[model samples]
Target: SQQTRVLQEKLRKLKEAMLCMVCCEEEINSTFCPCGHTVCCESCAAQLQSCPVCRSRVEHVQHVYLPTHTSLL
Candidate 1:
């Protein structure tokens, strides 16, 4: 019971932290694609375009996460 409780607590904290990154509002998940444009979520990633940030055709849409040691995500 104690272990389970601890894990649940960790999860709750993690969820709270991740909420911010994903909920960054306008342009939170929206970043420029390699084709000199902006995109959001997996939808943009699926387009297979260049990274709007660097204009590179990088297909790595890895879901970046915040530090979860002090929280969760």
Candidate 2:
């Protein structure tokens, strides 16, 4: 249906936009510090103790994994 097609397109675009800024290739899977900035990959996150963009002292790195709708279905 047209609605389903639109939803799929939007999801694809959102995923593309979420690509990690550090790697410029991998999908963003981690957030830096407590500043709440989510902009790096797991590989990059593991190597950092501070936010690359803001230089905030990191207290924790939160890994975020977003599953697609199809995976749930």
Candidate 3:
């Protein structure tokens, strides 16, 4: 089990960070309501009626955007 966790940690660190796990494109910025999962890109998640993370039917989610590295400059 530790091996699996270790590997998962490595994979997590190696992740693209912005790539979608479902379709792999367009800078993932989508979130599924109730399900609370956001793992796909805007174009891919725009018309989705279900959450890919839990396979749950989802509706009414708010769209969010990321800031420019906290803007300390």
What's each prediction's clash count? 10, 0, 0
Ranking by TM-score: 2, 3, 1
| Alpha-carbon lDDT of model 1 | 0.47
What TM-score number comes out for model 2?
A: 0.63
Candidate 1 lDDT, 30-57, residue by residue in tens: 3343343333444544565566445677
Model 3 agreement with the true structure over 11-62: per-residue lDDT tens digits:
8665666576777645567688878887877777777788877989877666
Alpha-carbon runs more than 4 Å astray in model 1: 1-39, 65-73
List clashing residue pairs in candidate 1: 13-72, 14-72, 14-73, 32-52, 33-50, 33-51, 33-52, 34-50, 34-51, 34-52
* lDDT tens readout by residue for model 2, 1-73: 9999999999988877778778887778788768988888889888888898899988989887766312233
Best by lDDT: 2
Better of 2 and 3 by TM-score: 2
How does each model score on TM-score?
0.31, 0.63, 0.61
lDDT of each: 0.47, 0.81, 0.71
The ten-residue window of minimal lDDT in model 1 covers 19-28
